[PDB]
Amino acid sequence: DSQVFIEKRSKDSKFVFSIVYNGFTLGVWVDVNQGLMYIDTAHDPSTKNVYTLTTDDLNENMMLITNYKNNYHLRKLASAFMNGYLRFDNQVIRNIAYELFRKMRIQ
């Protein structure tokens, strides 16, 4: 099933933040020189940049514009995905990221 955006994170990529989506944690990583972002299960368990996203959406984190003040890393994620710069470690992660993205909105 279309393993095109499927790349493992590069040696020089750096951790930036995590998303806990339902209860599953996804680590987001950046390769600065390449201009690519990667979503993997690996993460740093002590980071300040953590975002709880849930299917029912009580904290409104699926609302990119409602929460502009607080959600900077999510809006970048969504940009990178739309501008073609997001990479996923696995097809499973990919299917999870897709599902996450499907319930986001620009309001």
Next chain:
Amino acid sequence: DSQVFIEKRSKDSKFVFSIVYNGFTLGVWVDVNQGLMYIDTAHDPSTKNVYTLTTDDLNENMMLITNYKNNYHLRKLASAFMNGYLRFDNQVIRNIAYELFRKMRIQ
């Protein structure tokens, strides 16, 4: 009502494309040096870069990822809006752009 992202287009801004949303035409313009994009009613009636967006959405142009191949200018629009780089000529235009954005999705 919050006239913050309300700026008229700059002297050096250039036309890039239009969106016909329901039947109303919006011209999108870029100021390259400032890194800002503007939505106004002005447009170039002979451009090739035209995108028909409709509330019921038959052509699927509200699906940023479904139509990745064809919708490059829309994905940039949505990026600019989320990264804080979109400006609107009027509050009316703004309310229209907001409404347009509300029915878009990342699928």
